[PDB]
Each structure stands twice: as structure tokens, then as C-alpha cells.
Design an enzyme around this catalytic site. Structure first.
Site, PDB file in Angstrom:
ATOM      1  N   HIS A 118       0.800  -1.206   0.000  1.00 32.99           N
ATOM      2  CA  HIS A 118       0.000   0.000   0.000  1.00 32.99           C
ATOM      3  C   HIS A 118       0.836   1.261   0.000  1.00 32.99           C
ATOM      4  O   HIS A 118       0.526   2.203  -0.729  1.00 32.99           O
ATOM      5  CB  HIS A 118      -0.894   0.045   1.215  1.00 32.99           C
ATOM      6  CG  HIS A 118      -1.802   1.219   1.205  1.00 32.99           C
ATOM      7  ND1 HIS A 118      -2.234   1.837   2.353  1.00 32.99           N
ATOM      8  CD2 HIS A 118      -2.396   1.871   0.179  1.00 32.99           C
ATOM      9  CE1 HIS A 118      -3.011   2.855   2.034  1.00 32.99           C
ATOM     10  NE2 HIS A 118      -3.143   2.882   0.721  1.00 32.99           N
TER      11      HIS A 118
ATOM     12  N   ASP B  89      -3.109  -6.503  -2.144  1.00 35.11           N
ATOM     13  CA  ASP B  89      -2.214  -5.427  -1.696  1.00 35.11           C
ATOM     14  C   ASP B  89      -1.178  -5.968  -0.709  1.00 35.11           C
ATOM     15  O   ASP B  89      -1.039  -5.512   0.424  1.00 35.11           O
ATOM     16  CB  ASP B  89      -3.012  -4.242  -1.116  1.00 35.11           C
ATOM     17  CG  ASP B  89      -2.178  -2.985  -0.896  1.00 35.11           C
ATOM     18  OD1 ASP B  89      -0.961  -2.993  -1.153  1.00 35.11           O
ATOM     19  OD2 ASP B  89      -2.768  -1.977  -0.457  1.00 35.11           O
TER      20      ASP B  89
ATOM     21  N   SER C 246       1.149   0.889   9.172  1.00 34.24           N
ATOM     22  CA  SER C 246       0.909  -0.447   8.649  1.00 34.24           C
ATOM     23  C   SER C 246       2.182  -1.259   8.787  1.00 34.24           C
ATOM     24  O   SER C 246       3.285  -0.737   8.636  1.00 34.24           O
ATOM     25  CB  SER C 246       0.448  -0.364   7.204  1.00 34.24           C
ATOM     26  OG  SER C 246      -0.783   0.334   7.132  1.00 34.24           O
TER      27      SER C 246
END
EC number: 3.4.21.90
Lengths: 160, 160, 160
Positions: free
Chosen positions: B38, B60, B112
Site C-alpha cells: 500500500h 495489496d 501499517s
């Protein structure tokens, strides 16, 4: 006299690099970031060297605008300046008559970019180079009106 | 609860860089190195950015294979997952019903790439972004079968 | 950890000779006698070198059947293998994830033919050669299903 000053330059000083060798310094004041364009080099940070710059060799200064991330990390400033004691990285400086003074030789070449303060906290102005005196030195500073910037350069100096 | 966890991320976490500014994270699990595709950027290491990558935007995700030098520096892993307490970089997480939970807002955008564990040591799975809840948050994780990988994405989320 | 192991190899180890110079080893397991056919040589016993042999270079192994005299001198064996501590001629070995490990360099070339055990007594499997790791080594072992034999050979190894 040092118990108020010391925290500030840790917040507000980057310096320049050229060939892995520091030579100058750099400040971040108000809304616009500051560099004395006399020394060649690149700032020692990743991103903000990617910035626009506006140069006039008439003053030998250089500014840009701070991106919004670390915009809240600059000092305070004013233009009101009665004569009296003031302070800097190597001690206390005296000023009157449009003339700044400090005693002999406590500054070197390779030292441009040192901001100077008051007692009560805002930043004042910014140094360029030195001049021989006998006893108490002459400076080379650029400063501000209510509205305008101005250079003063007394006779018989050397551009650091 | 932190006395077993802390040594692991020091062994097993690199992160990504883009324009001298970190944004994501990266892990090294089992035999294949992991990146959630991402976020744009480059990994912060010299050599292994020279590697092959296989991308599907359907999930992703992004993997590559670890070269044999630091191959013995990845964690353990399994697929057996009864419901109960589990742990992560900011505390303890609860899981049941195919639904992971932690209380409000202790995660941010720009985060993330955080692996999550068990008590007894192997790594479990890997996070993507958040979803508003009222009190105890919803997650966004990709995980494993005995044989296959799988995404789960509950309604009303934001991709960090 | 050595108080159970030591009696076994005295019962169950012959080695190979070629030109009056040992290089490999040999075991006697269950019903069939074992030799890793990588190394040239003759077994160091009078009679059972007169035996039939069945060779496939696909696995680089070699068996024959034990004649009935010393048939009751082989170990026990099984295929049940949960992860955990195991043991061998130079210490204790750890195993998980289909991956065997022991720390650096405590094995040499000229050392094929070393069986490895459990705690509770049966023999497990048999080694071939090594692979560089950094810290904790990779192995090269052939092993068993419920029904079949199988090789595993991780990348970047050297055939001892």
C-alpha cells in the site's frame, strides 16, 4: 545567563554540509527558513533541500518557506531594541550606538549562522563575520526595521 | 506481557523510506520477506532492495525471498488459533468470532506493518488499517489457513 | 542428556574404510542395514561386505538386509515427530518448521552417517552434509513418512 538559552539551539539549529564536512549553520525563524548564502553546501536533512530558493547577492542571504510539518518549532522575534546586555553561543554581548561588541577573538572562520538573543526570549538577529579591533571586536550583522531588512558593515572586516 | 515480546522486533523489523521519511514497516517471516504494498517507498537497507517482487493488487501485499545471509533471523509461525488473549506493540489484543478487537484510537495512520503474536512465541498475522467503532476498535488483517492466505475486511474502514 | 545416549553407538555403529583410512560411518536400523553411498569405501567387517546392494543415485542412499546372526542389535525407530529438543553425537539439536538447527561449525567434512535421536529412545533420522548460516546451522537429512522415505535439501549447502 546560560540557564535560559541552551534549550533553544537544540530546537532551532540545522547546519550545512558539503563533501561530508560542516562549515556553516542554519536557522528557522518565524515563517521563513534562513541561510546565509556565503558558504557553499547542502543542508543536512533529507527533504527540505528540495525547496525553492530566492537569492540576491546584494545582501548574501537566502530564504525559503517552511513546510507545514515542523512549522511550530521556530523561535519568537521582534524589532524593539534598546541598548544593553545581550547573549549568544559564546557569552554575553554588549550593544549601543548601532555598534555591537564582544572582546577579542572568541570567534573563528567557519562560524557564520549564529543567532543572538535578548533576555526575555525572542531571537534578535544574525551574524556574518569579524573585524579587527585591538580589544573588543566589531561584528557584521543583518537586522530588521519595523518593516525592512538591513545590512550594516563597518570598515576593515573579513567575511567569515 | 512485555517481557517476552520486546527482543523480537529488534531482530525482525525493517521499515520503508521514501524521500528520507519513514511511513511503513517491513517484516521477515519464515522463508519469504514481507511488505504491505500500500505505501510507496524503498526499504532502508543497501542490498535487498535489488530483489525480485511479485505483486497482486487484489490483496495489496508483496513478497520476495530472503538471500541466504540473514535467513536465520526470522520468527516462528503457525496457523492454530483458538480464541483468547494476544499481544502487540501497543498492548494486548482480544480475538473471537473471526473478529479482532482493541480499544479506541491507540493506532494511527502511518502505521501499517505491525506483526502480532501469541503467548508462546510464534508470529501470527499482520495488520493493515482501522475502522471506527464507538469503544473497541475493528482491525484489518490478512491471515492464513493450513494452506492458503486470506484477507478479511469488515465494513466501514479506512485504509491506513 | 548424554547418560542415555552413549551405549547406543557402541552397539550400532560400523564405519567404512578405503585404503586403510576411515571417512564415513554406517548404521544398522530395524531390518535393513544402512549406508550413505556418497563416500567410496568398504565396510570394516569381514563378511557382510559380501552382500547384495540396491542403489539409486536419485537419493544417494544404500541398503541391504541384515543376515540373521546379529539381527537383534539394531535400534528402535518411529515416525512421530513433534517439534522440540533432540540429541546427537555432539550435543543437542532443535527442530521446528521442517527445519533442523544447531549452532555454528561443530560438524566437519568426513562426517556423514550420524544418526539422531529423541529422548525416549528410538532412532529418528540420518544426516548428510552442512550449509552456511551465520549463527545456527542448516542440516541435510533424509527421513520418513508413515510410509515413504524423503529427502530435504535446503539451498546453499555443501555435500559432506
Amino acid at each position: 545567563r546560560e540557564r535560559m538559552c541552551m534549550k533553544i539551539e537544540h530546537d532551532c539549529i540545522f547546519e550545512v554540509k558539503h563533501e561530508g564536512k560542516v562549515t556553516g549553520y542554519a536557522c528557522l525563524v518565524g515563517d521563513k527558513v534562513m541561510k546565509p548564502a556565503h558558504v557553499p553546501g547542502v543542508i543536512d536533512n533529507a527533504d527540505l533541500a528540495r525547496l525553492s530558493y530566492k537569492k540576491s547577492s546584494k545582501y548574501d542571504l537566502e530564504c525559503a518557506q517552511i513546510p507545514v510539518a515542523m512549522k511550530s518549532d521556530a523561535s519568537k522575534y521582534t524589532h524593539e531594541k534598546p541598548e544593553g546586555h545581550y547573549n549568544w553561543h559564546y557569552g554575553a554581548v554588549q550593544y549601543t550606538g548601532g555598534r555591537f561588541t564582544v572582546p577579542t577573538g572568541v570567534g573563528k572562520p567557519g562560524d557564520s549562522g549564529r543567532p543572538i538573543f535578548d533576555n526575555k526570549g525572542p531571537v534578535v538577529a544574525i551574524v556574518l563575520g569579524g573585524a579587527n579591533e585591538g580589544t573588543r571586536t566589531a561584528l557584521s550583522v543583518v537586522t530588521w526595521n519595523k518593516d525592512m531588512v538591513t545590512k550594516i558593515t563597518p570598515e576593515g572586516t573579513v567575511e567569515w
